[PDB]
């Protein structure tokens, strides 16, 4: 009759032997966020509003590499990026180099609608966030032990790795 929705939490090298501690929260994440997307479409929110809603929730799953739970740079810091696109108008919004913005996807939207630009990055994009008043957090709040441990292993191997790496 009408709506469909899909979502993801990352593509990569995920072993069949992903431990319970690593697997259940991601499986739970997928469900939680899918319930929300479905309910929003059921309540007929515009699809553009729905994808921002679902990604804010995906961003909020600590076990997915976006927002809280973002993987780390070679310097052990956080740099998040996001983009969003309305297929009906071709409008879009994007951001890069966020370190304190709690929900990057929502800044991408804000740039789309409130700026004659599509893409803002690094200091300038934190300036925009400050100006717009979105939620920002101490950088540490974005960091997970799992991610620190991955950096370490990637940093001795001298590799750039996908969150999901053997």
């Amino acid at each position: 009759g009408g709506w469909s929705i899909a979502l993801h939490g990352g593509a990569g090298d995920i072993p069949f032997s992903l431990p319970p501690e690593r697997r259940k929260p991601r499986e739970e994440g997928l469900r939680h966020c899918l319930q929300i997307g479905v309910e929003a479409l059921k309540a007929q929110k515009p699809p553009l509003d729905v994808v921002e809603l679902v990604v804010r929730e995906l961003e909020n799953i600590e076990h997915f590499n976006a927002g809280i739970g973002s993987v780390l740079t070679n310097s052990g810091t956080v740099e998040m990026e996001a983009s969003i696109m309305d297929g009906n108008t071709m409008k879009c919004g994007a951001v890069s180099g966020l370190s304190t913005v709690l929900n990057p996807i929502s800044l991408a939207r804000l740039v789309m609608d409130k700026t004659p630009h599509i893409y803002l990055a690094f200091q300038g994009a934190q300036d925009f966030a400050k100006q717009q008043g979105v939620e920002t957090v101490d950088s540490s709040h974005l960091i997970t032990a799992e991610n620190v441990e991955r950096l370490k292993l990637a940093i001795e191997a001298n590799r750039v790795q996908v969150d999901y790496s053997q």
Partner: peptide
């Protein structure tokens, strides 16, 4: 006059 940080 682009905002600082604006990528094209």
């Amino acid at each position: 006059n682009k905002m600082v940080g604006r990528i094209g």
